[PDB]
Amino acid sequence: QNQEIDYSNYPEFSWDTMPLYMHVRKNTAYTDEEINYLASFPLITLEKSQAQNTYGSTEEGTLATASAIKLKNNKAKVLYYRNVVINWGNYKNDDEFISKNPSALLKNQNNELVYMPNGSTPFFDITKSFVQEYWLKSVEDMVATPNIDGTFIDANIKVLVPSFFSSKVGVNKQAEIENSYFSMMSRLKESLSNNLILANIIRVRPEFEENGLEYLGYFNGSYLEGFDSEAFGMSNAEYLVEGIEATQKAAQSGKIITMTLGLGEAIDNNTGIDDQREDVDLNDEELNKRVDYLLAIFLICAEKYSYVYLHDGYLATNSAVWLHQFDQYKKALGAPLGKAIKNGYIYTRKFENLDVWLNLETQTATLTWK
Amino acid sequence: IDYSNYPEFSWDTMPLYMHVRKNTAYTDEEINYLASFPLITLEKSQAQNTYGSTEEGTLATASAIKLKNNKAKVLYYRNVVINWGNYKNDDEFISKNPSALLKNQNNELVYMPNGSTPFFDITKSFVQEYWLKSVEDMVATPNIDGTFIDANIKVLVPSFFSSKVGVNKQAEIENSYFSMMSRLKESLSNNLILANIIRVRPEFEENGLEYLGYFNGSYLEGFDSEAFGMSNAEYLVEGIEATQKAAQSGKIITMTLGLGEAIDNNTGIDDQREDVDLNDEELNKRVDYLLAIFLICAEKYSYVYLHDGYLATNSAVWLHQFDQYKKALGAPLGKAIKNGYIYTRKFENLDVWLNLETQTATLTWK
Numbered sequence A: 001q002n003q004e005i006d007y008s009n010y011p012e013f014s015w016d017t018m019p020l021y022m023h024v025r026k027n028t029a030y031t032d033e034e035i036n037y038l039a040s041f042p043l044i045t046l047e048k049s050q051a052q053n054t055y056g057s058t059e060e061g062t063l064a065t066a067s068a069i070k071l072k073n074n075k076a077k078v079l080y081y082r083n084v085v086i087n088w089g090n091y092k093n094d095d096e097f098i099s100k101n102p103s104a105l106l107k108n109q110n111n112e113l114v115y116m117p118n119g120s121t122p123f124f125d126i127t128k129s130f131v132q133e134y135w136l137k138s139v140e141d142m143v144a145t146p147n148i149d150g151t152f153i154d155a156n157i158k159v160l161v162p163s164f165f166s167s168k169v170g171v172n173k174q175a176e177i178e179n180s181y182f183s184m185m186s187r188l189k190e191s192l193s194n195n196l197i198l199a200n201i202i203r204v205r206p207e208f209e210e211n212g213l214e215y216l217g218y219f220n221g222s223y224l225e226g227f228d229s230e231a232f233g234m235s236n237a238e239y240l241v242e243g244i245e246a247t248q249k250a251a252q253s254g255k256i257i258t259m260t261l262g263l264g265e266a267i268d269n270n271t272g273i274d275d276q277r278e279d280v281d282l283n284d285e286e287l288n289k290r291v292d293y294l295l296a297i298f299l300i301c302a303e304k305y306s307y308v309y310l311h312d313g314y315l316a317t318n319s320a321v322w323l324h325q326f327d328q329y330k331k332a333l334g335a336p337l338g339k340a341i342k343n344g345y346i347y348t349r350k351f352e353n354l355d356v357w358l359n360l361e362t363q364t365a366t367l368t369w370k
Numbered sequence B: 001i002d003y004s005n006y007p008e009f010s011w012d013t014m015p016l017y018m019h020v021r022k023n024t025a026y027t028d029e030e031i032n033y034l035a036s037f038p039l040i041t042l043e044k045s046q047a048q049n050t051y052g053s054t055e056e057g058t059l060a061t062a063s064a065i066k067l068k069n070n071k072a073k074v075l076y077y078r079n080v081v082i083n084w085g086n087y088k089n090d091d092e093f094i095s096k097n098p099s100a101l102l103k104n105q106n107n108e109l110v111y112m113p114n115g116s117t118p119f120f121d122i123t124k125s126f127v128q129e130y131w132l133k134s135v136e137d138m139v140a141t142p143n144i145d146g147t148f149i150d151a152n153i154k155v156l157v158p159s160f161f162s163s164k165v166g167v168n169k170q171a172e173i174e175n176s177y178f179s180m181m182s183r184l185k186e187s188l189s190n191n192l193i194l195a196n197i198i199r200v201r202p203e204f205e206e207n208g209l210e211y212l213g214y215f216n217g218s219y220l221e222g223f224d225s226e227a228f229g230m231s232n233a234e235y236l237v238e239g240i241e242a243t244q245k246a247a248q249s250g251k252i253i254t255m256t257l258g259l260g261e262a263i264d265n266n267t268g269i270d271d272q273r274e275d276v277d278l279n280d281e282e283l284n285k286r287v288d289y290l291l292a293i294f295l296i297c298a299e300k301y302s303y304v305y306l307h308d309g310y311l312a313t314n315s316a317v318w319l320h321q322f323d324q325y326k327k328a329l330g331a332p333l334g335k336a337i338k339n340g341y342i343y344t345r346k347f348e349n350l351d352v353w354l355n356l357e358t359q360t361a362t363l364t365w366k
Ligand SMILES: C[C@@H]1O[C@@H](O[C@H]2[C@H](OS(=O)(=O)O)[C@H](O[C@@H]3[C@H](O)[C@H](C)O[C@@H](O)[C@H]3OS(=O)(=O)O)O[C@@H](C)[C@H]2OS(=O)(=O)O)[C@@H](O)[C@H](O)[C@@H]1O
Pocket: A025, A047, A048, A049, A083, A086, A088, A154, A155, A200, A225, A314, A315
């Protein structure tokens, strides 16, 4: 049920160099230097727990951060994170809503609250009309402010994979949650039609016939995580083949893609728990081979409005790549000269200033910059 | 050695340790389970969403455990430097005394990797006294037998705090830490003090034994998690040697070992978490291996916990007894013998075989 494509409210995009995405939180205000860094990205999602130890709440920390970004670069697009079912902390208005309205939280068929794996974070019962209205208004009100361009909707997949809630609250309640989810996304599709809606939705799933593409009709694009984390008995290569296919199709349909890929395992060095975390050599040859590989996966998929983030977590103060620009982000890229060519697990693609070769079996790639 | 305050111990079957938290009160069944262990540490965030605070949730839990088995020994967790949440008395103390928290030279708070949990500045006398009294007051209550002191190694590895507040402030933190542990050694001399202290470290020529004189025993973690460029096998060799020496000297050992991959199945994030078959052949091989490491080290007052995290409601082994915990074990008939990376040890009802290099063990039960 995709809408006719209208790019009026889309972020800036250029093929000149790597198109980059930022997805970030910090417990206190960003420094001036950090704001300048954020404002250099074309598309930024502000996560939950947004500077709440400076501004008292995520709502106020989001407003302050977005204002500061826009004053440095008013062309940067800023999205507000919102989880559609998990009642995470540090939203002052959510705390008040739940305090005053305990019936807003999700219960199992034995009338017990159900929780995330930490045993303490509960869920919104979005089947209840007043919860739907509270949640929708909270998103619409924040997006209507001058420095927020849209919203990042999270936990779509927890709604849509039936076992996630059916194992907690039963089969019928899962279907009711899903029905209400669709109602709520229909509401946002209309109310935010002059804004951006990005969702955490494309994902290799045995339950999804089209690996999330069938759910993109509500959204201007998808964020990607778990993209190289195989499951379901599939090999790493098999799993990436399906994710690449889905991402290519979505990107070629004009949807925004924000592909996140973790470097945490390539940076970890067995330090930082009971000793100082050893400074990572960001020029390390092996680390840069990993950057090449992950960027090759992205470039095999990318179209206009595709953006990449190679991250060490979304908390700014605990990320080894915070404030850093890899050399691969500065080199001339240029527009594609064709689609990727797939031969088994080997992919190639040509850009005006770059040739990409990717082997998913060996988890190696070459970026030959021209 | 004064054993008068030590826990019960028997070689009849595997000697077990429990180390646990839950956000709400334990059920009756869960209290009975806890009371079946000879030694239990109640972690931070102890039933605080039922009792309002870890302090009162600890008191309620300990009272219930002791009513079911008054011989069970119950320890109160206390972190010597990290200001973790859900202690109502700490929240009051820190709100009234913001200067109690550790700051750098710019008077900025420094934090754990989460960027939000700060540290006690134990270089300040009033912080030392608040902390010591908080431990002594809780241990003095009738259903608590002692304390589990955590984060010793964050004080004693100089880079942990020097990288945050400088080498000289770290040296002062260390000096104050030793003063505090000398104080506790005396005030808790009729109680138990267990510390997270034995650990393979390049900074520790004796891998933590040089600090064990303050305490009745050591808890072990990170025991099979190599670092510093060391092989897994040689890292375990050094930990085994430290643990053997401590146990043979009469110190309590509580060895925790994470079940690890064997109990992880790549589900539960966006889908239902699938049952891991607790009678699986491969899991049972991992249990055999981890218990073999323990048994190569164990002496009287050594206890083991093979875990899937310390949060009861998120652990696949909560309330579970592996078959290896029920079989007759019996007293050791000699110390372990080390031949390369292969260790053997005989007990009255068990022969242990262990190969660190392949991470394999054979338990031959009689
Ligand atoms: C602010 C922190 O929130 C919880 O941690 C989350 C974690 O959030 S973080 O901002 O990435 O650190 C992250 O949340 C996911 C993230 O939002 C991406 C974009 O989409 C989903 O994967 C999010 O997960 S979920 O909302 O569907 O669950 O990952 C979660 C699993 C949490 O991480 S966890 O490892 O801590 O469980 C808190 O748990 C943190 O303590 C912190 O408050």
